[model samples]
Target: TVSIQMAGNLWKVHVKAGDQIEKGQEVAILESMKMEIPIVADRSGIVKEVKKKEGDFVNEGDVLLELSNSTQ
Candidate 1:
């Protein structure tokens, strides 16, 4: 799973639910005070769910994407 490290709106979602993702892949971009923060995957896995949508305001520590390592 991946979590938001800072409060911000999701600028763009690069991956979808049920997609295969790699470690360190840019999953989303977080917009914070005009700064673009690239949210990445911590491990390789199948993206199980997308918890937030583009332009959705997210808080720090909120789960962004759920991944299943069993598929990797």
Candidate 2:
């Protein structure tokens, strides 16, 4: 799973649902306090869901997307 670490506006999402992502990859961007924060995947997986969209306000520790490691 991927999440935002701070309260901010969801600036952009780089990957969509069903996209394959790797650890340390930039999955989304968050704008908080006039700065941009990059959200990354913690493990290699397939994105199962995107919970937020661009311009959405998100709180700290909020789930931005869900991922599944299983390839089945």
Candidate 3:
């Protein structure tokens, strides 16, 4: 699972379950204290689940999504 380490509002989700994602790819956009922050993938993998929807609020270390990788 990958989590967000910032307090922010989810602006957009770029990928869905079963989508293959590359490391460093932007998975979502977050609005943090008036700025837009892009949430990126830390590892290459298949998106397994999205824990939150767009326009949702999240805090630091919040589980944003779960992923299953070839290495897993």
lDDT by candidate, in order shown:
0.88, 0.87, 0.87
The worst-scoring run of ten residues by lDDT in candidate 3 lies at 63-72
RMSD values for the candidates in order, in angstroms, are 1.5, 1.4, 1.6
Model 1 spans with C-alpha error above 4 angstroms? 69-72
Off by over 4 Å in 2: 69-71
lDDT of 2 by residue, 4-71 (tens): 88999999988888899889988888999989988888777889888999889999899989887566
Question: Candidate 3 lDDT, tens digit per residue, 3-58?
Answer: 78899898998888999888898898889888998999888889899898899999
- Model 3 quality (TM-score): 0.89
lDDT of candidate model 2 versus the reference? 0.87
Collision pairs in model 3: none
Compare the candidates by lDDT and give the number of the best one.
Answer: 1
Model 1 has a clash total of: 0
Listed in order, each prediction's TM-score against the native is 0.88, 0.89, 0.89
Instruction: Give the clashing pairs for model 1.
Output: none
* lDDT (Cα, 0-100) at 11 in candidate 3: 90
Candidate 2 is scored at a TM of 0.89
